[PDB]
Amino acid sequence: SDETLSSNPLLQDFDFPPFDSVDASHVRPGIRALLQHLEAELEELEKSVEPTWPKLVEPLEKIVDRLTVVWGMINHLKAVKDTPELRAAIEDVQPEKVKFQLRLGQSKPIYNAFKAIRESPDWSSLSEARQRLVEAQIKEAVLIGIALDDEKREEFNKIEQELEKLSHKFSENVLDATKKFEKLITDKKEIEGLPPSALGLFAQAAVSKGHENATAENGPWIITLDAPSYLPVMQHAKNRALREEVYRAYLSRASSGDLDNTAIIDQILKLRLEKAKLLGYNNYAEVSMAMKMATVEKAAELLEKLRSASWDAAVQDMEDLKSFAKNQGAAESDSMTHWDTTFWSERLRESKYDINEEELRPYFSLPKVMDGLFSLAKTLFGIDIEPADGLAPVWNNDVRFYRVKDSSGNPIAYFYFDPYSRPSEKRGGAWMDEVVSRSRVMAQKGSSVRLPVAHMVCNQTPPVGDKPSLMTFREVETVFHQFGHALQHMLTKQDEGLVAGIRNIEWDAVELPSQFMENWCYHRDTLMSIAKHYETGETLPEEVYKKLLAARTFRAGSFSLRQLKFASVDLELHTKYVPGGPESIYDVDQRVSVKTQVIPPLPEDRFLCSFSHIFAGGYAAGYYSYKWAEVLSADAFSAFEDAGLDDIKAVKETGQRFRNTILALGGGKAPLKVFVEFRGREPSPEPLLRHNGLL
Amino acid sequence: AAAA
Ligand SMILES: [Cl-]
Ligand code: NA
Ligand SMILES: [Zn+2]
């Protein structure tokens, strides 16, 4: 009302997206008008197409870029600022958007022009990045069904449309299920063991639900299923009945009634298999592997190698917990269950290493963590990062915005950071997303390149009262992880937009720079630069750092097996499993767990209903990508170990090489080749095993 | 999304 369609924020030229002025009401008109314009642009491209950059690749990027940026900003708002109105609007336009993506991807004039470039007599003279681009476009067109005759084509497109709808539904159900659970505790006794920080959070939560007399010390408390609330309960609640209840609630999220994801999963797997068959593959995992470094065989081999290396340690971890609980006179030591594991692990960790998480929190405040992280980035990669709040519109008052500068003081990139748990409207977990890519084609008139912009999103414990966000070590690692992704997007030296940043990096290599960054949390200079008391300003005592260092490999076997269980169940569901038979996804879960867990899952276990990585994310038949890339990240880190981590000259020289290979080259060179350029040789799994004490 |  009262504004023209032509003034819709989604239709404007912008440097930074209008995150402060876009809502549900803009989505239907904006997306539908945009799609009409992109249709006309595609028609013009197809009519004039030649196998050259100006006549094919440049006009293609302009179309792809506009849709990616605008849809990206809408989907980002869905992820961080969900509303019923925004859900409805996205649902309403999603089929039109998907129809256009299929139309574009299945363009025969575009595909034929790319094949002509591939078939050029001087192909070998084309730059590696441009060769990678052409090869990717050809492969992607076949994977989006371009080779199918019109009847099989129609079936393929119906499958794509339904999968898109189901993945959105899956994620909405997960958000809604996490949102729904509320445990009100009145009796002070039932919350025995919960530390001041958790009490302070549960009370702050109680205030927002009406209980205005609620304090941390005395007033009522609300327990929720988002991570910053859920974890402290499982770690610290002495009331075993409370642990079992909260555990069972977490484990059954989105698994019954209106929010049930079971049938959605069943349909997703059915459609994925139908898609695989249409494309001439045996199963969906083979489809997934087409764009990955791995094959089904090689992924399974790595998982089995890591599983074999982890099993004995995981068994010993279990025995250690039993022994410790028994030595405390704990009645449940004779019958330890899944709702005892986290609790007794924490008690064991406290006793064995003499470190208490609550006492560490004052040393890990977000502002100091960011300062230390930026200092590390300067040391390794030669970049200066500074606050730039006000330059770009944001969607929430807690969102930080930063400018990244090179050594000459020239901006090279920007990023947003949305750090705190906000379960009413914001997806759980942590992630990085692209905002705009580094691109020559999308540059402003006069300048050579559009600078890249990234999102980092975490869900860490929110600030309590007036104090800064005080963090756990895991939360620190999570920030370093997402920053690693942001760096690969931001520090890319490719100006070929379609292979810049993280684009066209085989999915099983994208977790390299992220997991790589996590290693530095244990690097003494880095940890000490971060760990300053938020009030006092005093540096973490040396003796405490040594305890943190000692605890690094605690339960590494168990942590490893847990990841391998996730990766193995993913692979199994997309290879051997056939939907529609008497066997359920939970039967698959039980079978795979025999070799990847020391005790069976509960029969009531419904973790699959919240496994968004594989049902509403990029990791379907691909969760193994974490461990695949962790071999790479650990080995990359071992180059610094070899060079001398106590030698700042060596650290900077090695950091520069990492900056100029892994962070610079995007998908413009095969990831194995990029890795070899950095490492000097092909990867070894020895560093990964050594770092985790599993040799 | 590059998750974690
Ligand atoms: Cl076609
Ligand atoms: Na492959
Ligand atoms: Zn990641």
Per-residue 3-state assignment (H helix, E strand, C coil) for A253-278: CCCCHHHCCHHHHHHHHHHHHHHHHH
Query: Which experimental approach was used here?
Result: X-ray
CA distance A307 to A571: 14
Which residues have CB under 8 Å from A400's CB, separation 6+? A370, A387, A389, A416, A417, A419
Q: Name beta bridge partners: A405.
A: A384, A411
DSSP symbols for A575-607: TT--TTSS--HHHHHHHHHHHH-SSPPPTT--G
Look up residue A140 and give its amino acid.
E
Helix (H) or strand (E) holding A321: helix A296-327
Start-to-end CA span in chain B (Å): 10
CA distance A487 to A664: 9
Look up residue A21 and give its amino acid.
S
Å from CA of A298 to ligand 2 middle: 9
Of A648, A641, A653, A650, the closest CA to residue A688 belongs to A641
Q: Name beta bridge partners: A400.
A: A417
3-state secondary structure A14-34: CCCCCCCCCCHHHHHHHHHHH
Give the distance from residue B1's alpha carbon to the nearest chain A alpha carbon, in angstroms.
5
**What architecture is the A1-143+355-554+623-695 domain classified under in CATH?**
Orthogonal Bundle (1.10)
Of A74, A90, A88, the closest CA to residue A17 belongs to A74
CA distance A127 to A668: 9
Vertex A671 angle, CA A670 and A673, to 5°: 70
Contact B4 A431 (CB under 8 A): yes
The residue whose two tokens read 């039967």 is A587
Chain A interface residues (partner B, CB cutoff 8 A): 429-433, 478, 481-482, 485, 502, 510-511, 514, 613, 617-619
Identify all chain B residues contacting A429, using CB atoms and an 8 Å cutoff: 3-4
DSSP state of A452: P
Which residues have CB under 8 Å from A641's CB, separation 6+? A687
Contact B4 A478 (CB under 8 A): yes
User: What does the CA dihedral A255, A260, A264, A265 come to, rounded to 10 degrees?
Assistant: 0
Q: Name beta bridge partners: A433.
A: A455
Nearest to A502 among B2, B3, B4 (CB): B2
Instruction: Give the largest CA-CA distance in chain B.
Output: 10
A390: how many CB neighbours lie within 10 A of its CB? Answer: 8
Contact A430 B3 (CB under 8 A): yes
CA distance A673 to A440: 24
CA distance A27 to A70: 10
The residue whose two tokens read 């298999």 is A273
Vertex A662 angle, CA A455 and A101, to 5°: 50
CA distance A50 to A110: 9
Of A492, A499, A436, the closest CA to residue A668 belongs to A499
Using DSSP's 3-state secondary structure scheme, residue A511 falls into coil
DSSP state of A8: -
Contact B2 A514 (CB under 8 A): yes
Count the helix, strand and coil residues of chain B and give each as a percent rounded to the nearest 5: 0, 25, 75
Å from CA of A151 to ligand 1 middle: 11
Query: What is each CA distance from A96 to A30, A34, A599, in whole angstroms?
Result: 12, 11, 47
Query: What is each CA distance from A367 to A228, A362, A373, A476, A617, in whole angstroms?
Result: 19, 12, 10, 11, 30
The residue whose two tokens read 């600022």 is A81
Assess contact for A177 and A259: CB atoms under 8 A: yes
A465 token code pair: 């009262």
A202, with CB counted inside 10 A (0-12, 13-18, 19+), is buried
Q: Can you say how many angstroms the Cα of residue A454 is from the centroid of all Cα atoms in its chain?
A: 13
Which residues have CB under 8 Å from A179's CB, separation 6+? A423, A424
Look up residue A80 and give its amino acid.
V
Task: State the pairing for strand pair A411-420/A453-460.
Answer: parallel
Assess contact for A218 and A196: CB atoms under 8 A: no
DSSP symbols for A403-424: EEE-TTS-EEEEEEEEEE--TT
CA distance A416 to A402: 7
The residue whose two tokens read 């595909």 is A111
Task: State the pairing for strand pair A400-405/A431-436.
Answer: unpaired
Please compute Rg for chain A using Cα positions.
Answer: 25
Of A199, A179, A172, A200, the closest CA to residue A188 belongs to A199
Query: What is each CA distance from A662 to A427, A512, A523, in whole angstroms?
Result: 29, 8, 21
Which residues have CB under 8 Å from A611's CB, separation 6+? A566, A570
Of A641, A618, A616, the closest CA to residue A629 belongs to A618
Helix (H) or strand (E) holding A302: helix A296-327
Domain ranges of chain A: 1-143+355-554+623-695, 144-354+555-622
Instruction: Give the largest CA-CA distance in chain A.
Output: 80
Of A249, A200, A208, the closest CA to residue A228 belongs to A200
Look up residue A237 and give its amino acid.
A
A112: how many CB neighbours lie within 10 A of its CB? Answer: 13
A118: how many CB neighbours lie within 10 A of its CB? Answer: 15
DSSP state of A53: I
CA distance A694 to A313: 8
Give the distance from residue B2's alpha carbon to the nearest chain A alpha carbon, in angstroms.
5
A529 token code pair: 């630069």
Identify all chain B residues contacting A481, using CB atoms and an 8 Å cutoff: 4
CA distance A121 to A599: 60
Helices (H), A49-83: 58-80
A563-596 core/surface letters (b: 16 or more CB in 10 A; e: else): bbbbbbbbbbbbbebebeeeeebbebbbebbeeb
